[PDB]
From a paper:
The virion is composed of a structurally distinctive capsid (called core-antigen) containing the genome and polymerase, and surrounded by a lipid envelope with embedded surface-antigen protein. Capsids are composed of a 183-residue polypeptide, the first 140 residues of which suffice for capsid assembly. The assembly domain is also unusual in that it polymerizes according to two different geometries i.e. T = 3 and T = 4 icosahedral quasi-symmetry. Accordingly, the same polypeptide chain exists in seven quasi-equivalent environments (A, B, and C in T = 3 capsids, and A, B, C, and D in T = 4 capsids).
The T = 3 and T = 4 capsids were reconstructed to essentially the same final resolution– 3.5 and 3.6 Å, respectively, and atomic models built into the resulting density maps. In the current T = 4 structure the corresponding Cα-RMSD values are similar: AB (0.792 Å), AC (0.737 Å), and AD (0.603 Å). The same analysis was then performed on the T = 4 capsid described here, with similar results. The CB interface involved ca. 25% less area, 18% lower free energy, and 42% less burial of V124. In the T = 4 capsid, several residues were identified as hot spots with high confidence. In particular, F23 and F122 were identified with high confidence in all four interfaces, and when these residues were mutated to Alanine and the proteins expressed in E. coli, capsid expression was either largely (F122A) or completely (F23A) inhibited. In contrast, R127, which when mutated to Alanine enhances the solubility of capsid dimers, was identified with high confidence in the AA, BD, and DC interfaces but it was not identified as important at the CB interface. In T = 4 capsids there are two forms of trimer-of-dimers, Types I and II. As Type I has the lower potential energy, this form should persist and nucleate T = 4 capsid assembly for protracted periods.
Author numbering:
A (entry chain B), D (entry chain B), E (entry chain D): 1 to 143
B (entry chain A), C (entry chain A), F (entry chain C): 1 to 142
The structure:
């Protein structure tokens, strides 16, 4: 069970490790986006796509991790350990959760095919060194 | 954002508030059962039933948390915070992950409706004093 | 070569990893039951169901191992190695042979699907703390 | 329950005790043969013939006996007992398991009828003393 | 024989001397992208295109070379020679492996004709002196 | 990417490693044969068959390894490391490249099915003992 979360969505995780951290914007932005755009889809008792379901589970998990951060904030005495822990959290689990959220929400809004083709073109782009790399990378949209 | 992860299956988090904490099992056994019964359906490219997807994401989350715990165990100095964090994980977040995993596993194998009937029958069983309560609470099979 | 002997029946060795060791019964009683219920179908020339074939080969293997144990008991000098080997057989290899025999016997008599349901229901029963667990775990019959 | 493992395959064990040990080659050769030729049949969750099923069970049993040998190798102090035990193993259980494996795999590759007729002719052959016995015994093939 | 490997696909090594070295990105990025895209089709027991087959052979070649690198790292004593071997490998032979990977992967995604047109357009781009050279080097897209 | 390159042609490294290593000829004679027969087809602009393509890429890999060999021979100072590296190459990677080249060449000349049958028959020949084995090993041909 080395399970790939994207295998049922056509892609893999090695695909997405090509592109950097900074392209993934803040967790709070993605959560607010998801809420504002698809609260009707999330809260309703009908699953339109498995993207929505994994999105629900990821949002719940991230809420639990925020509870973890708060609990460690309100109980531990050593500032070093607390800072190190929250740094690890908001860096690495931030990376992974932002990745997952971006993929699911992008595939919903713009379509699975378009996202896969975008990631193909981006993997071709960023894998080019600066000399022959264009300065303004591809951007995402439907048509 | 105020989501109940069970809203899409007819169930509700309040419905599991019937069940106590101690009832749900250790995590290692759950993961072992899940793998040994559904390895091929998990790793394969198919969302044959969305319970599979929830199980995928839950297992990945628990792996992420185990990586967190190991990272903390092999980097920090004060063992107080270390053991405290490990305890907090394995108790409190273990509760949520156990809830979610148990539910989705039971729904995969035995069926959603039968699981709902199991939960409500257990709530009837436990909303009852000890004496007239039979000592063999319901456990499920087909 | 990495074979699971249960792969051909929808089951999996990981699925039996739910069950503990002590649960499965002594070997002599299993062999007695097997013979007394299926002597004619075993010795007869017919592979009416492949569980019969697995049972044949398993009984022959256990007879081979009992012959091994007797051969060691009536040829060696140091009783340490003697009793050690006998213990190792009757515990560790007994585990595998008991697993295999119990499964194939239950599948012969009661049915493959019902046995799978039995295993998963037992896993639900045991992935549960002691208190809310009923003290009458499922046992099977028709 | 003096069960014959071959009664459901047309033959018996007294049939095969006519022919010698040496005709059965090494266990490792047979296992590697079985793997190389029919890993797709073994590992798949579909039983094509009861030969395959008994083959699975025999391979698992032999793996367990190898585990037995290793365990005795790693725990006992008396070299005499260890050597005697492993000798018994690789001689006698070697004989039986090689017999079983050869029969099943041969019947699969070449057919049950051909194997039974081969064993008939061989029992007629080796049961002849050297004077009137041919020097180059029968060999196995389809056509 | 000095086979021109790109000869089946209308392309040349002369066509690749248009491109500089730095244009090709790091090998780990290539492998990660290739995995996350087409891991299933690679491990799939089917030859979808000769591109796939050459890609499989090249991945195995790189695996052999990295295994060699690890062996030499874990057994050799003369350190300057060791480091020089490692750098020589991962630069000089990594270059050609990157050429191979990039070509076949881009041909899989976007098509052979498109890659050829890309290469000749890039040649027109770089063979222009830097003054009147436009600032945007072309890249690829399904847009 | 647990890749086995022979999957495109109905075989595996395990099916191929069923033979010993000594059977596999030296790489030099293989390149001699392959060149002196199919140089015109392999340098051609034509994907005549995937066997040719795997052969092309494999020959590139081996030529590049020989380039490495010459670089090492003409640029290191410590001859011990030179010997270790070079003989390690021609043993370990020599084995794999020999296997690959022989497979694809045999498939070109005689045909895929025939080479598979030859592997099977030769292995069953060589592992079976000589007395009851056929007197001569089979040798593949149309």
């Amino acid at each position: 069970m080395d399970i790939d979360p994207y295998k049922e969505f056509g892609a893999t995780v090695e695909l997405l490790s090509f592109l950097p951290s900074d392209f993934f914007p803040s967790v709070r932005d993605l959560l607010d986006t998801a809420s504002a755009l698809y609260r009707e889809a999330l809260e309703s008792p009908e699953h339109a796509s498995p993207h929505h379901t994994a999105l629900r589970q990821a949002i719940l998990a991230w809420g639990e991790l925020m509870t973890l951060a708060t609990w460690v904030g309100n109980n531990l005495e050593d500032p070093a350990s607390r800072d190190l822990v929250v740094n690890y959290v908001n860096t690495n689990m931030g990376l992974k959760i932002r990745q997952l959220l971006w993929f699911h929400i992008s595939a919903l809004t713009f379509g699975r095919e378009t996202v896969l083709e975008y990631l193909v073109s981006f993997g071709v782009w960023i894998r080019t060194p600066p000399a022959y790399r264009p300065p303004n990378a591809p951007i995402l949209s439907t048509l």
